[PDB]
Design an enzyme around this catalytic site. Structure first.
Site, PDB file in Angstrom:
ATOM      1  N   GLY A  16       0.667   6.021  -0.108  1.00  0.00           N
ATOM      2  CA  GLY A  16       0.010   7.204  -0.440  1.00  0.00           C
ATOM      3  C   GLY A  16       0.593   8.727   0.069  1.00  0.00           C
ATOM      4  O   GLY A  16       1.814   8.310  -0.070  1.00  0.00           O
ATOM      5  N   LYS A  22       5.060  -0.554   8.481  1.00  0.00           N
ATOM      6  CA  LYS A  22       4.448   0.722   8.330  1.00  0.00           C
ATOM      7  C   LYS A  22       5.407   1.707   8.228  1.00  0.00           C
ATOM      8  O   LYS A  22       5.933   2.188   9.363  1.00  0.00           O
ATOM      9  CB  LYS A  22       3.288   0.787   9.199  1.00  0.00           C
ATOM     10  CG  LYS A  22       2.217  -0.321   9.635  1.00  0.00           C
ATOM     11  CD  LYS A  22       0.922   0.237  10.052  1.00  0.00           C
ATOM     12  CE  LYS A  22      -0.103  -0.699   9.809  1.00  0.00           C
ATOM     13  NZ  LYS A  22      -1.415  -0.516  10.178  1.00  0.00           N
ATOM     14  N   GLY A  44       2.458   7.362   3.952  1.00  0.00           N
ATOM     15  CA  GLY A  44       3.703   6.668   3.758  1.00  0.00           C
ATOM     16  C   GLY A  44       3.721   5.391   2.850  1.00  0.00           C
ATOM     17  O   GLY A  44       3.105   5.705   1.848  1.00  0.00           O
ATOM     18  N   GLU A  45       4.122   4.552   3.182  1.00  0.00           N
ATOM     19  CA  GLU A  45       4.038   3.197   2.514  1.00  0.00           C
ATOM     20  C   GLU A  45       3.636   1.885   3.601  1.00  0.00           C
ATOM     21  O   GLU A  45       3.902   2.257   4.694  1.00  0.00           O
ATOM     22  CB  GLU A  45       5.478   2.883   1.844  1.00  0.00           C
ATOM     23  CG  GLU A  45       6.297   3.894   1.036  1.00  0.00           C
ATOM     24  CD  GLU A  45       6.162   3.747  -0.268  1.00  0.00           C
ATOM     25  OE1 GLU A  45       6.736   4.749  -0.873  1.00  0.00           O
ATOM     26  OE2 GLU A  45       5.638   2.731  -0.863  1.00  0.00           O
ATOM     27  N   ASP A  87     -12.153   4.843  14.442  1.00  0.00           N
ATOM     28  CA  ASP A  87     -12.242   4.565  12.938  1.00  0.00           C
ATOM     29  C   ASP A  87     -12.569   3.178  12.480  1.00  0.00           C
ATOM     30  O   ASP A  87     -11.920   2.550  11.803  1.00  0.00           O
ATOM     31  CB  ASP A  87     -10.876   4.966  12.514  1.00  0.00           C
ATOM     32  CG  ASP A  87     -10.691   5.448  10.994  1.00  0.00           C
ATOM     33  OD1 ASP A  87     -11.795   5.444  10.283  1.00  0.00           O
ATOM     34  OD2 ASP A  87      -9.773   5.595  10.554  1.00  0.00           O
ATOM     35  N   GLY A  89       0.583  -1.093  -0.137  1.00  0.00           N
ATOM     36  CA  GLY A  89      -0.147   0.036   0.007  1.00  0.00           C
ATOM     37  C   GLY A  89       1.012   1.323  -0.028  1.00  0.00           C
ATOM     38  O   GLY A  89       1.989   1.275   0.180  1.00  0.00           O
TER      39      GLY A  89
HETATM   40  N1  LIG Z   1      -0.511  -5.366   8.907  1.00  0.00           N
HETATM   41  C1  LIG Z   1      -0.626  -5.688   7.487  1.00  0.00           C
HETATM   42  N2  LIG Z   1      -0.727  -6.714   7.174  1.00  0.00           N
HETATM   43  C2  LIG Z   1      -1.114  -7.008   5.692  1.00  0.00           C
HETATM   44  N3  LIG Z   1      -1.329  -5.879   4.772  1.00  0.00           N
HETATM   45  C3  LIG Z   1      -1.725  -4.750   5.216  1.00  0.00           C
HETATM   46  C4  LIG Z   1      -1.317  -4.582   6.700  1.00  0.00           C
HETATM   47  N4  LIG Z   1      -1.431  -3.057   6.984  1.00  0.00           N
HETATM   48  C5  LIG Z   1      -1.916  -2.595   5.857  1.00  0.00           C
HETATM   49  N5  LIG Z   1      -2.037  -3.560   4.887  1.00  0.00           N
HETATM   50  C6  LIG Z   1      -2.344  -3.211   3.505  1.00  0.00           C
HETATM   51  O1  LIG Z   1      -1.761  -1.696   3.079  1.00  0.00           O
HETATM   52  C7  LIG Z   1      -2.922  -0.849   3.025  1.00  0.00           C
HETATM   53  C8  LIG Z   1      -2.304   0.061   3.965  1.00  0.00           C
HETATM   54  O2  LIG Z   1      -3.320   1.100   4.598  1.00  0.00           O
HETATM   55  P1  LIG Z   1      -3.341   1.208   6.168  1.00  0.00           P
HETATM   56  O3  LIG Z   1      -4.685   0.162   6.591  1.00  0.00           O
HETATM   57  O4  LIG Z   1      -3.450   2.478   6.854  1.00  0.00           O
HETATM   58  O5  LIG Z   1      -1.983   0.469   6.831  1.00  0.00           O
HETATM   59  C9  LIG Z   1      -3.999  -1.632   3.510  1.00  0.00           C
HETATM   60  O6  LIG Z   1      -5.303  -1.267   3.026  1.00  0.00           O
HETATM   61  C10 LIG Z   1      -3.724  -3.133   3.345  1.00  0.00           C
HETATM   62  O7  LIG Z   1      -4.320  -3.604   1.858  1.00  0.00           O
END
Ligand SMILES: Nc1ncnc2c1ncn2[C@@H]1O[C@H](COP(=O)(O)O)[C@@H](O)[C@H]1O
Length: 267
Positions: free
Chosen positions: A18, A37, A21-22, A128, A16
């Protein structure tokens, strides 16, 4: 205490991205598959990003994505459990959503309710809760993620469509505002990822919701599941069910509530 040296991990595949970050799939100590993250160095203050980790330190449960480690120096990483299936929203909207029916979907809701029941017990609020912030693993395991806005029941702007009106209007964030959100989440589950309040914008949502408008029963969704949704959306926050209640109602659903359930074309 949660600190690890950065050379302990290797970022393999991008998942992912934006202005945030990444997010990376990687290996920790050459053995453990992890999720990493990353923050883009200069989009938000150093610890406003890192607050997510600090709440994740206090909260451990099998239905919450679990914090592994943190690299405090820049570049800054939050290391967590790897969820092989990604977002609930994406899973629901994609090729895997075709074949999910009520029994699987109610089971996913019940797992999320289990995680939220813990949050409830701990005197926290998530703030959230939505399908985009649920992560799916192998075997339909669903975990609540993204604790960036979570705080203890001792931000700036909040998605009207998932936020309880008293929390959006007056900042009254309680576990009951999270119950409101869980009801919205239940419509995401039964419409397979569709945005709530179709064809309504935010301003329309607010006054509609204030005047008493609630989403109707989704097609093929039993009325008894919609009834549970509407309990989650009661105007009085204290009239709303507990997650303890939601978890048990959902676990028992096909024996206590719909013993006569028959699969349809979509649910
Ligand atoms: N802990 C994780 N394990 C696997 N995929 C993840 C994880 N965290 C985020 N992602 C993926 O990356 C995207 C990043 O957005 P976020 O939920 O803010 O981390 C998410 O919608 C997932 O598709």
């Amino acid at each position: 205490a949660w600190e690890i040296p950065r050379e302990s991990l290797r970022l393999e595949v991008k998942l992912g991205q934006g202005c945030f970050g990444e997010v990376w799939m990687g290996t920790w100590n050459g053995t453990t598959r992890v999720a990493i993250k990353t923050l883009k160095p200069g989009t938000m203050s150093p610890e406003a990003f890192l607050q997510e980790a600090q709440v994740m330190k206090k909260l451990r449960h099998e239905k919450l994505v679990q914090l592994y480690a943190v690299v405090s120096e820049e570049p800054i990483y939050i290391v967590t459990e790897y969820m092989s299936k990604g977002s609930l929203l994406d899973f629901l909207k994609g090729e895997m959503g075709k074949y999910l029916r009520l029994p699987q979907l109610v089971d996913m809701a019940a797992q999320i309710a289990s995680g939220m029941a813990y949050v409830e017990r701990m005197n926290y609020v998530h703030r959230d809760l939505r399908a985009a912030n649920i992560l799916v693993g192998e075997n339909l395991v669903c975990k609540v993620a993204d604790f960036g806005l979570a705080r203890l029941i001792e931000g700036a702007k909040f998605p009207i469509k998932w936020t309880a009106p008293e929390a959006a209007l007056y900042g009254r964030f309680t576990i009951k505002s999270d119950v409101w959100s869980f009801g919205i989440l239940l419509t995401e589950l039964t419409t397979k990822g569709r945005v709530p309040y179709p064809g309504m914008v935010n301003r329309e949502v607010l006054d509609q919701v204030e005047r008493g408008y609630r989403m109707p029963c989704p097609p093929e969704c039993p009325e008894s599941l919609h009834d549970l949704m509407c309990q989650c959306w009661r105007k009085d926050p204290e009239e709303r069910p507990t997650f303890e209640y939601l978890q048990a109602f959902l676990e028992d659903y096909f024996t206590s509530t719909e013993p006569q359930y028959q699969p349809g074309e979509n649910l």
